[PDB]
């Protein structure tokens with residue numbers, strides 16, 4: 117099973133910022149011009165939810181102020197202006213290559 | 226798509242408990258439904274043996290000869306019975322109807338099952 | 343086509359990416375043209391090679407199978423574009439978790455157009471039954487392709503072989519033809535390389551295997567493997583496989599046809615008859 | 629002369645006028661004083677004439 | 678070939694043991710020529726013939 | 727036997743010369759309209 | 766890799782058709798040569814008489 121490294125596996129951040137945090141991939145994760153790496157928000161006290169698919173093409177249902185980014189091996193999303201409801205645990209899982217495996221997690225307060 | 230689990234919360238290690246997640250909005254179609262384990266101290270694993278829309282089975286690695294996931298079409302809820310129980314397996318079980326290239330977005334809030342003697 | 347071949351125009355290996363959805367009144371196949379990058383051939387491939395080089399092109403539509411509990415990017419180290427890539431128009435549907443399983447998928451596509459489709463789909467002949475427990479999962483593997491006309495229920499051949507440039511697993515793969523308002527179901531629980539771009543046709547063309555270069559300034563219609571036969575003459579002793587609107591092959595290299603009369607130099611009997619001599623000094627008439 | 633050992637294809641398909649199951653079926657030729665054995669434990673549509 | 682046949686020159690049944698590894702500018706097949714001794718035929722045998 | 731020429735007319739009579747030996751379209755320079763009994 | 770039997774059938778057919786047309790081509794030209802010398806010697810008679 118793929119052990120995706122989160123480093124830093126603990127942080128919490130201030131208002132209006134931009135954060136670059138990595139679940140990094142250790143296997144062959146290049147294809148199709150892209151990687152199949154989705155993310156999910158998990159608020160403590162709420163069920164989780166999708167936010168990104170196919171790094172360029174975000175969903176509608178969140179405001180689009182999240183920005184999944186990357187081209188290459190180790191990927192990292194970007195946020196612009198952070199608000200009060202960003203206080204959550206930002207997991208993901210892997211879907212790109214066999215097998216499926218979840219994140220670290222990392223924190224955000 | 227909002228969807229709710231159901232299952233009895235008082236159960237012993239070594240006996241059977243069943244999980245029942247109501248799939249609101251639509252039935253078991255070309256998008257099937259998976260499951261996810263929640264562990265203690267906030268870590269995950271995709272334990273969910275899932276049933277497709279044709280009636281088959283796909284366990285976890287550690288849990289092959291261990292369970293059974295099959296589909297029922299009448300109640301929009303797949304059939305499963307979790308035997309073999311152990312106090313380490315106490316966790317909240319989140320059903321999720323998949324789309325696999327949006328994400329497992331059709332997701333559950335979990336009926337908190339506490340597994341202890 | 344160059345490094346692309348005829349049967350790669352459907353499949354799109356990385357030597358064919360600029361020919362995926364082409365348009366032609368002449369396709370030209372090359373001796374170096376691999377139809378494959380994870381090695382193999384087709385099944386009844388000479389039948390399919392006589393449709394695609396009479397098609398005109400290959401127009402496509404998405405099929406749009408929303409694959410679920412799946413992967414999409416089965417990539418291998420012999421189909422490089424920049425790194426690990428694959429055919430542009432197929433997907434290794436390999437499993438969620440490593441040795442777990444890969445359940446049944448029933449996938450339908452209703453042809454909804456004016457034209458006959460030319461579909462293709464893949465079965466994966468792996469090297470062993472230890473790769474098809476980590477690619478797909480334990481148990482027997484069925485891919486069932488039942489249209490309104492067909493019923494085939496294919497199965498792979500997981501045996502070892504000497505290597506074509508790097509791997510001991512093969513693929514060989516199959517193809518049907520739809521008619522308007524039909525359907526194709528793909529029932530499969532492993533080892534299946536689905537399409538994602540159903541293929542259509544364009545009309546008139548021809549198609550030649552050859553090894554010499556392209557002259558876009560000259561015009562012709564008789565195209566064998568070593569050039570082009572351009573004259574008004576009814577027979578050729580150049581190639582007995584001269585396809586196109588060609589003359590008819592013979593084996594006599596010289597069939598001289600007497601566009602003048604007899605020489606008698608210095609069935610009626612005056613040509614080589616009582617008129618006993620030809621004349622050298624007439625060039626205006628006969 | 630023959631030995632074939634057939635097997636079916638239990639897969640779904642678009643429908644020809646009502647059903648999603650097919651049949652497709654096979655044929656040999658005998659010569660005088662031959663025999664044909666039919667060994668089968670399912671899925672077989674025998675002749676009677 | 679006699680009791681040997683064409684496709685027996687590869688396989689060598691006991692009617693073909695003097696033709697296992699032959700050399701010819703003409704082979705001649707016979708009506709009585711079994712290509713087989715534990716009975717059967719080949720597959721796509723007209724191609725190999 | 728199938729062919730592709732729709733009209734393969736086979737000359738069941740001689741030449742018209744209306745008003746390989748050389749008398750049909752030769753020194754006999756004219757056909758005749760008023761013979762129906764013989765050729 | 767064309768199929769062994771039908772490639773022999775095509776080669777049986779093509780070489781027949783090759784022997785059809787080359788017999789035709791040899792016969793046609795020799796017929797047309799004899800005819801051309803027939804229609805070359807003919808208008809000796811048509812000129813000289």
Ligand SMILES: *[C@@H]1O[C@H](CO)[C@@H](O)[C@H](O)[C@H]1NC(C)=O
Nearest residue numbers: 767768769770771772773776
């Ligand atoms: C058919 O004949 C050609 C040459 O005439 C030869 O190259 C080819 O191998 C032959 N094929 C078979 C199947 O005999």
